Amino acid sequence: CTMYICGDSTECSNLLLQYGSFCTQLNRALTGIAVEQDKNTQEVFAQVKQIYKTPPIKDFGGFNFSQILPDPSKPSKRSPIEDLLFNKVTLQKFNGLTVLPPLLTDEMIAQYTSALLAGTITSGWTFGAGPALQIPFPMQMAYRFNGIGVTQNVLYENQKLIANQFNSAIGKIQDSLSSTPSALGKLQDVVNQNAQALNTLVKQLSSNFGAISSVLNDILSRLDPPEAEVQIDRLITGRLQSLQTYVTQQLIRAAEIRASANLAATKMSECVLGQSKRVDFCGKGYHLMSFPQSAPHGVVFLHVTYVPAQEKNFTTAP
């Protein structure tokens, strides 16, 4: 608050000091937001007490996860989809405003999503409730089919078709994300809104707010203190009001992001860690399983669902 509103001017600093606690309450609000952002990331991704790892042999019954599992050949152990997401959303700090790093780095968040995905692949939902109990993946998917009212024999008799459909849908996902823009709009909009808020906050420093000049040093260097002090107080009031507007807008936007993060953590717990009977909560269709993927300032869920296909009319009786 002190460097933004007034800067390197003691004559000005003394006037800023007569407004009491405004700078400490704005630093308190901004620190509160900064801490809740790390709480959001921790609650959404850090849902596993242990880091699980996939086996070296991908004998998953024909199911191809090479597009969602980390690629050991890459410099940051990212999956193809996650690498595409980091390459699709694209993201200034010289007037006393700085940006703090997150507590969880992108590498560490990717490691959490790898742990969650390896757990779901090798143990189904059992790693969420307690210890990770291995189960063959086709048998896991057969139980997930049983969970939606389709007897498990349907999967085993159609295992090759199911595996091929799953692999084709996963392959289609990368082409869709790489070919249909605005697909990542929910994260590009948040990045853009934060960049716009900071650009506006800095641009407000060029405004006069009624003072003869926006630069404090030329008014202080040309006008006598008994009269320059009024112009300084007016500029301080206008700039402080601008900072208060920025902080309030950030508090509301932080509340929106917190609600979204709570929803994301709920979806991770009830879609990735388990199987949801909640209709349309984990995508359109009867939910089978979900896969988390990290993205800049967000999470992407790949929801695998069972959708009824061609149908025939029959006569009935109760």
């Binding site: 596993v48 242990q50 790892k53 700085t98 742990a115 757990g119 063959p136």
Partner: protein, 166 residues
């Protein structure tokens, strides 16, 4: 340095630049309406202005009920300019010893590093949990043989004091 170029005053570090100013322009500004570089008079050269480093100072403390030893984190300055000093991607932390082995995060610092143990303050990369692998195969299932019933406590606020100001 505190510079004054043809009436534009300010404080910053003046360095050499490769920004091709046109013959008629004297100073250039970045996005957001602030000066990025300026053309010196008498010698006609293009100097970039980068604000001299500044940043908040954070104190790492275990608590007055444990020890009076503290560590100081310089967030966005390097400390190679004005007892151990460790450079992290969040800034340079002085007074905390860097230990290679990871532990559960206690005091968050940033960029994956957290930081009292063994009579001193330590700084380390946080662990994400115990590393294990599941014995996956295509014909092996693990089935529990004994329940345990656990009780967990989740605490949620519901209301706040109903204050009123006249």
């Amino acid at each position: 340095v505190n510079f004054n170029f043809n009436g534009l005053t300010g404080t910053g570090v003046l360095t050499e630049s490769n920004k091709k100013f046109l013959p008629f322009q004297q100073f250039g500004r970045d996005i957001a309406d602030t000066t990025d570089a300026v053309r010196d008079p008498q010698t006609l050269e293009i100097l970039d202005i980068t604000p001299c480093s500044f940043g908040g100072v954070s104190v790492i403390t275990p608590g007055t009920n444990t020890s009076n030893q503290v560590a100081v984190l310089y967030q966005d300055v390097n400390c190679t300019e004005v007892s151990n000093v460790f450079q992290t991607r969040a800034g340079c932390l002085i007074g905390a010893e860097h230990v290679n082995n990871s532990y559960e995060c206690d005091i968050p610092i940033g960029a994956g590093i957290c930081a009292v143990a063994s009579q001193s303050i330590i700084a380390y990369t946080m662990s994400l949990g115990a590393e294990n692998s599941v014995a996956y195969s295509n014909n092996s299932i693990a089935i529990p043989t004994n329940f345990t019933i656990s009780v967990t406590t989740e605490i949620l606020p519901v209301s706040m004091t109903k204050t009123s100001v006249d």
